[PDB]
Design a protein around this ligand. Structure first.
Ligand SMILES: Nc1ncnc2c1ncn2[C@@H]1O[C@H](CSCC[C@H](N)C(=O)O)[C@@H](O)[C@H]1O
Lengths: 189, 240
């Protein structure tokens, strides 16, 4: 469910010509993104098991000329790809949160976009690491279970070598108090 | 010109407010109620207190000594009238001072600093859109800057002291980042939206001087139902 939220949150304008997914598993995010962009997508997965399915899913869906898997560690991969991507998106799980954000800055084009989903307790630390690697936080969205609940999940978008100022989108409430998904959540999926 | 009015539905609370100065807002009320007022907070400080609406509300919940710092002398006079009028002279004191220089002179004195800062930076003629220099000096960063407020809050606070702020949501990371720069660890956060479909316009943020990491993101506050009426959650803050 995280992966559907982070996918639809990605700001997919026409400047996106090359996108990357950190720790792509079955390539669910690339496949979802596929339905909104013509940019070439690259998914990076450290485990061969997941590589077969993701490749299988790109085969089954006939996007082999748009999406591609790469069997690598995000850290080593990113040192090899300076100023490459318009978007890096990562749905985190030997790789720390600082590693993900550093790696993202090592391989984004200037004014490119880094999109992450994570636990709400970690918002201030992610914001400090964004700034430590010259990523300027831009869009935030909170995820709450019910209207009376503390947020569990945050969605965070930032621009590498961008300017200052945030946009905080209307909080998302996943389900009503009957434990039925809210109409708002249904727009996703 | 001063007018006397009740401080929303807070019982035994009235306050004068001048039409050519800043009049309190929902922001003032919510940042007062968002403060943590546990028994350890023994001394409190309001940065830029104006007519002292924030102390007047905090006092309904704690017996701590409350100091209000304010720079515009016409407001200190109104503030001191409101404290006497409500008989709070024993608890609340007003000091005509600059936040910066006050903080340099009263270092490590407080367990809690709260602040409803001027929201807008300086960019052109600030008075062009205001009715009076005294309003412009409350809404724009002409006599104080955001970094000054946070730096000053760190000079005034004591270990495990608590800085509480309300501000525009566009500047949340800037604020987060200035917190870390002065060793204030963000802890509690709540977004305020007008409507369930609107972008958050305001944030409430709290953090601990020389504390630890870890954030609690409280449920978003919607202030209006789609029918344009105050929500029931908001009306809970209109009284004690
Ligand atoms: N440098 C400074 N030192 C002390 N107060 C200052 C200041 N610069 C601005 N202020 C004051 O800060 C206030 C900001 S408006 C906040 C009003 C009030 N605390 C409320 O919640 O409604 C103004 O009254 C302004 O005079």
């Amino acid at each position: 469910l995280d992966s559907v939220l982070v996918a639809r949150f990605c700001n997919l304008n026409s400047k996106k010509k090359k996108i990357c997914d950190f720790g792509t598993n079955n390539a669910v995010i690339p496949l979802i993104l596929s339905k909104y962009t013509k940019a070439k997508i690259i998914g990076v997965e450290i485990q061969n098991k997941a590589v077969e399915i993701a490749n299988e899913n790109i085969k089954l869906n006939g996007l082999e000329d748009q999406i591609e898997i790469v069997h690598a560690d995000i850290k080593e991969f990113s040192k090899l790809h300076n100023q490459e991507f318009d978007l890096v998106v990562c749905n985190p799980p030997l790789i720390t949160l600082e590693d993900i954000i550093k790696s993202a800055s090592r391989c984004l084009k200037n004014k490119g976009n880094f999109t992450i989903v994570h636990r709400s307790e970690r918002l201030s630390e992610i914001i400090n690491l964004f700034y430590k690697y010259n990523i300027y936080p831009k869009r935030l969205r909170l995820i709450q279970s019910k209207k009376t609940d503390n947020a569990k999940m945050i969605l965070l978008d930032g621009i590498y070598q961008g300017n200052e100022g945030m946009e905080i989108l209307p909080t998302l409430i996943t389900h009503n108090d009957d434990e039925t998904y809210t109409d708002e959540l249904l727009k996703y999926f």
